[PDB]
Amino acid sequence: GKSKKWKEILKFPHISQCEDLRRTIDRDYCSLCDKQPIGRLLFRQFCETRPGLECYIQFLDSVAEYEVTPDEKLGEKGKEIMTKYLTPKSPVFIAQVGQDLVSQTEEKLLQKPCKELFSACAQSVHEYLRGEPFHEYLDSMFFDRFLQWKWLERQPVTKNTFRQYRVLGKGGFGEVCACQVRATGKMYACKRLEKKRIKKRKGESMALNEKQILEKVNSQFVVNLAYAYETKDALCLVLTIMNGGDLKFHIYNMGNPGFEEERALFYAAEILCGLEDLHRENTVYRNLKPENILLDDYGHIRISDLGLAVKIPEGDLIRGRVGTVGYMAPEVLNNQRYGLSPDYWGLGCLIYEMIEGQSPFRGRKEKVKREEVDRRVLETEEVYSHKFSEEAKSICKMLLTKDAKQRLGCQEEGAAEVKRHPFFRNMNFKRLEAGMLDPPFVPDPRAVYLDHTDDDFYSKFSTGSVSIPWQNEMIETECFKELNVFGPNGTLPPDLNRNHP
Ligand SMILES: Cc1[nH]c(/C=C2\C(=O)N=C3CC=C(C(=O)N[C@H](C)c4ccccc4)C=C32)c(C)c1C(=O)NC1(C)CCNCC1
User: Between the CA of residue 397 and those of 41, 265, 344, 359, what are the distances in Å?
Assistant: 46, 15, 11, 13
Hey, whose CA ends up nearest to atom 3 of ligand 1?
242
Q: Omega before 257 cis (within 30°)? A: yes
Separation between Cα atoms, residue 101 and residue 118, nearest integer Å? 10
- Could you tell me where the beta strands, DSSP code E, fall in 73-186? 162-170, 174-181
Pocket test for ligand 1, best of 198, 217, 242 (most atoms within 8 A of CB): 242
Å from CA of 324 to ligand 1 middle: 18
Query: In 3D, which of 173, 153, 290, 283 has the Cα closest to residue 218?
Result: 283
Q: Is 399 in contact with 348 (CB distance < 8 Å)?
A: yes
Query: In 3D, which of 182, 144, 115, 256 has the Cα closest to residue 473?
Result: 182
- Dihedral of the alpha carbons of 61, 72, 298, 387, in degrees to the nearest 10: -150
DSSP letter (8 states) at residue 224:
P
The set of protein residues with a Cβ atom below 6 angstroms from ligand 1 is 168-176, 189, 191, 223, 239-243, 245, 304-305, 307, 448-449
Atom number of ligand 1 nearest to Cα 169:
28
Separation between Cα atoms, residue 407 and residue 430, nearest integer Å? 25
Pocket test for ligand 1, best of 190, 304, 324, 446 (most atoms within 8 A of CB): 304
Atom number of ligand 1 nearest to Cα 174:
22
Q: Enumerate residues 6+ apart whose C-beta is below 8 A from 298.
A: 244, 439, 442
- What determination technique applies here? X-ray
User: Between the CA of residue 248 and those of 353, 393, 479, what are the distances in Å?
Assistant: 9, 21, 36
Domains of the chain: 6-154+478-496 (1.10.167.10), 159-243+450-465 (3.30.200.20), 247-433 (1.10.510.10)
Query: In 3D, which of 237, 221, 217, 240 has the Cα closest to residue 229?
Result: 237
Hey, whose CA ends up nearest to atom 19 of ligand 1?
171
Alpha helices in 258-389 (DSSP H): 261-280, 330-333, 341-356, 370-379
User: Between the CA of residue 152 and those of 14, 17, 155, 156, 467, what are the distances in Å?
Assistant: 11, 11, 5, 9, 11
Å from CA of 246 to ligand 1 middle: 9
CB atoms within 10 A of CB 427: 17
Q: What residues are paired with 175 via a beta bridge?
A: 170, 192
Hey, whose CA ends up nearest to atom 9 of ligand 1?
241
Separation between Cα atoms, residue 119 and residue 378, nearest integer Å? 46
Å from CA of 179 to ligand 1 middle: 12
Å from CA of 439 to ligand 1 middle: 21
Q: Which amino acid is at 124?
A: S
Separation between Cα atoms, residue 252 and residue 357, nearest integer Å? 7
Q: What are phi and psi of 182, to 5 degrees?
A: -60, -45
For the chain, give the longest Cα–Cα distance.
78
Q: 3-state DSSP call for residue 311?
A: strand
Separation between Cα atoms, residue 352 and residue 400, nearest integer Å? 9
Atom number of ligand 1 nearest to Cα 243:
37
